[PDB]
Amino acid sequence: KNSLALSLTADQMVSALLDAEPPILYSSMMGLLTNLADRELVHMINWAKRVPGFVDLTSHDQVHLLECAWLEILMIGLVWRSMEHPGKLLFAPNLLLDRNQGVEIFDMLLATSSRFRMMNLQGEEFVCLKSIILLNSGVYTFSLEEKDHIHRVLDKITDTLIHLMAKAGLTLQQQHQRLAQLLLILSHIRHMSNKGMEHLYSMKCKNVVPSYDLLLEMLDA
Amino acid sequence: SLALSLTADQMVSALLDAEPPIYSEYDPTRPFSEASMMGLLTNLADRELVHMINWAKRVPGFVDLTSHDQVHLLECAWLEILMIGLVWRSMEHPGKLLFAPNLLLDRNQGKCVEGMVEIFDMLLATSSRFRMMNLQGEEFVCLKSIILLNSGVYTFTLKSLEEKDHIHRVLDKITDTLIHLMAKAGLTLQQQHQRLAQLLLILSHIRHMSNKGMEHLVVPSYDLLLEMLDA
Numbered sequence: 422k423n424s425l426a427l428s429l430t431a432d433q434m435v436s437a438l439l440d441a442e443p444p445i446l447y448s449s450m451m452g453l454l455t456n457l458a459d460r461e462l463v464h465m466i467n468w469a470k471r472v473p474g475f476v477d478l479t480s481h482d483q484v485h486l487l488e489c490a491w492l493e494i495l496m497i498g499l500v501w502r503s504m505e506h507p508g509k510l511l512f513a514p515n516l517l518l519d520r521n522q523g524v525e526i527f528d529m530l531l532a533t534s535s536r537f538r539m540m541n542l543q544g545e546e547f548v549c550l551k552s553i554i555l556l557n558s559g560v561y562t563f564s565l566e567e568k569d570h571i572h573r574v575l576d577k578i579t580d581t582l583i584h585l586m587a588k589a590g591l592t593l594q595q596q597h598q599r600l601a602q603l604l605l606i607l608s609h610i611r612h613m614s615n616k617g618m619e620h621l622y623s624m625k626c627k628n629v630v631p632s633y634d635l636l637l638e639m640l641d642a
Numbered sequence: 643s644l645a646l647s648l649t650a651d652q653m654v655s656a657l658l659d660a661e662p663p664i665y666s667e668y669d670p671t672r673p674f675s676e677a678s679m680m681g682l683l684t685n686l687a688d689r690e691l692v693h694m695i696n697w698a699k700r701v702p703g704f705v706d707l708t709s710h711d712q713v714h715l716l717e718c719a720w721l722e723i724l725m726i727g728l729v730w731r732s733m734e735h736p737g738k739l740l741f742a743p744n745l746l747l748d749r750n751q752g753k754c755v756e757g758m759v760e761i762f763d764m765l766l767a768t769s770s771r772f773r774m775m776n777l778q779g780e781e782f783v784c785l786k787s788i789i790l791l792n793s794g795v796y797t798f799t800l801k802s803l804e805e806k807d808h809i810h811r812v813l814d815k816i817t818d819t820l821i822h823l824m825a826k827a828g829l830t831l832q833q834q835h836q837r838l839a840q841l842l843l844i845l846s847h848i849r850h851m852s853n854k855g856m857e858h859l860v861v862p863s864y865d866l867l868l869e870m871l872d873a
């Protein structure tokens with residue numbers, strides 16, 4: 422493809438993703454969280470359309486990626502928002518919870534926030550990671566041209582991460598180490614998403630996960 | 643500990659040397675029932691686990707951890723480790739899963755067990771991805787060791803902070819090792835960072851498959867893992 426996305430510099434990629442960032446939204450615990458997530462989803466769709474390369478995909482492939490990524494995306498945002506509140510999860514500025522208000526999944530989310538803190542994760546890195554989640558989470562479960570495009574965009578995001586690190590003065594060795602540390606946390610975000618989904622099902626909340634058709638209609642709108 | 647003093651070459655040699663052996667029951671009644679196929683796979687996994695513990699003990703850094711932390715890591719990783727091994731064995735058999743030399747199954751056979759075809763299809767896609775990437779054996783063994791160290795590190799006092807820090811340093815050494823292998827192969831710096839990312843991103847898919855596998859469902863107990871570690 423002669424795609425605009427593939428011509429982007431590291432700086433343009435960061436700029437696009439920072440510009441696409443949704444606002445931090447305000448708020449029965451499950452009731453509150455469901456209402457918040459539902460409002461977040463609307464923003465997520467519109468954000469996804471702004472991730473470079475995402476709209477080059479067929480509508481079907483866009484929906485597939487969103488279906489596979491949505492809860493991981495919510496989670497990573499939660500973790501980012503909570504990074505400067507040790508021991509707490511900032512679901513919203515008016516819904517900031519500690520463990521006691523929880524717990525298995527709460528504890529996993531808190532450990533991720535601690536990891537982000539210990540690594541001094543930067544906003545520019547965060548937005549790259551969130552975009553990787555969107556592009557990567559569904560890419561192994563899809564056509565050939567689409568997968569190739571996704572992987573080329575993913576490679577651009579890698580290049581962008583490395584450029585950011587090099588600009589901040591990290592040595593080559595530090596760059597590769599940090600890249601790996603950031604990407605390895607994604608496996609834990611996937612794990613938490615799967616546990617979350619298993620828990621949404623266990624609480625009889627199958628209804629609240631967005632369907633293929635819901636996402637499709639939301640993308641078209 | 644000297645694990646963190648290893649060179650990239652020594653890390654690769656240690657991991658290659660540590661590799662566990664590769665059979666299923668001879669002449670099982672075929673076709674399989676749901677019960678009989680699950681019986682075969684359970685028997686195979688159970689025997690593989692014993693060799694997995696022996697392998698884990700030889701992953702540089704692993705035995706520096708407390709016994710409790712060793713078991714925690716194995717509890718979190720065991721299914722992913724079995725699955726990556728399966729995917730690796732299956733690379734040169736497009737459309738098939740080489741559970742054992744004598745148990746080579748296609749996706750239609752996954753249908754014999756309720757819920758299993760979906761996991762089979764994900765495993766097959768991973769094998770195709772490894773093939774498309776020309777995954778090398780030296781890379782494979784690094785990735786498998788990453789899984790062991792990474793999967794449970796986020797779900798663990800001064801001691802605990804030192805345990806986590808040690809794990810992360812060993813993970814850093816394996817990263818360095820992967821990069822060295824790539825640089826030695828002649829990849830450009832850009833190509834190196836790209837391939838590293840591509841490989842680590844597949845690990846999130848392996849996680850996913852393990853989680854789904856665990857669900858749809860014979861899981862090894864804390865006590866069994868601990869006994870095997872001590873023996």
Ligand SMILES: COC(=O)/C=C/c1ccc(N(CC(F)(F)F)S(=O)(=O)[C@@H]2C[C@@H]3O[C@H]2C(c2ccc(O)cc2)=C3c2ccc(O)cc2)cc1
Nearest residue numbers: 449450451454455457458495496499526527617620621629
């Ligand atoms: C009646 O109220 C109750 O008793 C039940 C209370 C309760 C409350 C949360 C629980 N989880 C574990 C966590 F986050 F708490 F640690 S979670 O299921 O994995 C699930 C995941 C994550 O936390 C839940 C919630 C969610 C998502 C979609 C919905 O439609 C409704 C809720 C998430 C979320 C993350 C980021 C964000 O920006 C917005 C939402 C578990 C029991």
